[model samples]
Target: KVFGRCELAAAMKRHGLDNYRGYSLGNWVCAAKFESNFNTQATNRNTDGSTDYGILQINSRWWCNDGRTPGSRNLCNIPCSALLSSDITASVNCAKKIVSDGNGMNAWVAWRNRCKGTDVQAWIRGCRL
Candidate 1:
């Protein structure tokens, strides 16, 4: 599912991502914006043969078991397909787990390049608080 900017912002907020792990809601918004453009069915194939899945662009090498990535840890223990659904619950839950790692939020270059140190309030300006 493709989400409108405000729609995605509201969803992220409901999923408890407002200031989650020192990353603002805008950070998550920006990451998702660049990662998958709020499209839940997004997927990417890495050069290393690992694939990224879903809205958060979760990596199969470490997070989900796609049975494609070499020796995938599947740390999240979730099937890669589950994240591709329009509902963000599994993706959000997996993201929460991924962000708990020390280098979590920094995993997304989009967040670092776009949201870091910037005024992110504009990203959530409308669609309610």
Candidate 2:
């Protein structure tokens, strides 16, 4: 399912992404905008055969088990399919793991290039959280 900009922001906030790991909602919101435009079913395939899954685009190579990545670590311990749900819980939980694993928001270059070092607050304007 797809979501509006502020709607997605509120959703992420509901799941506790506001200040997760010292990162703001804008970091999460902007990353989602660039990564998938707030669409939960977005997937990207890397040349290494790792597919990024869901809204946050968790990678099958290191986070989720997709049964095709050959040596996936499955650090989040959930099926890759779980991230495509509109509920967004899996994506948030896995993202927390990715950040808490010491990768921080840098785990996603989308966040690094598009969300980081910018006026992230603009991403959540008009949204009451």
Candidate 3:
């Protein structure tokens, strides 16, 4: 794991990811918790053959190139492996693009399924952000 909850919250705030565009800091932190538990190297294969990568679990089908996915849009212009790094700058930038494209956090199933309507304040509690 790359971060404990408070550590991740601090990093996200420092990165200006606590509140970017229209999404709340709570939304970002909550989604990250469920997506990869703040693990930069986290990866999971979807049943559809697409793979999820990094802390936000960006999918290979659209955001990043994983090579295994044919004709991937690679809209983020990043290699999926790059998203797996300890530094989350690239991943956060890519996620911004994804949200800017009008999907918002709805692009992440983890966000929709897990973080959407719950009490997300706890995700940032005691972070001093």
Q: Write down the worst ten-residue block by lDDT for model 3.
A: 14-23
Winner by TM-score: 2
**True-vs-predicted CA distance for residue 114, candidate 2, Å:** 1.1
Q: Taking the tens digit of each residue's C-alpha lDDT, what string does model 3 give over 1-129?
A: 588888877777777776687777888988898899889999999888889999899999999998998767799999999999888888888988887887778988889999888888878877777
Pairs that collide in candidate 1 are none
Best by lDDT: 2
Candidate 2 local lDDT, residue 126: 82
Better of 2 and 3 by TM-score: 2
lDDT of 1: 0.86
Say which prediction, candidate 2 or candidate 3, comes out ahead on lDDT: 2
**Candidate 1 TM-score, true structure as reference:** 0.94
What is candidate 3's TM-score against the reference? Answer: 0.93
lDDT of each: 0.86, 0.92, 0.86
Error of 1 at 84 (Å): 0.8
Candidate 1 lDDT, 73-116, residue by residue in tens: 98888999999997888888899988998786887767777767
Off by over 4 Å in 1: none
Each prediction's Cα RMSD? Answer: 1.1, 0.8, 1.2
Work out how many backbone clashes candidate 2 has.
0
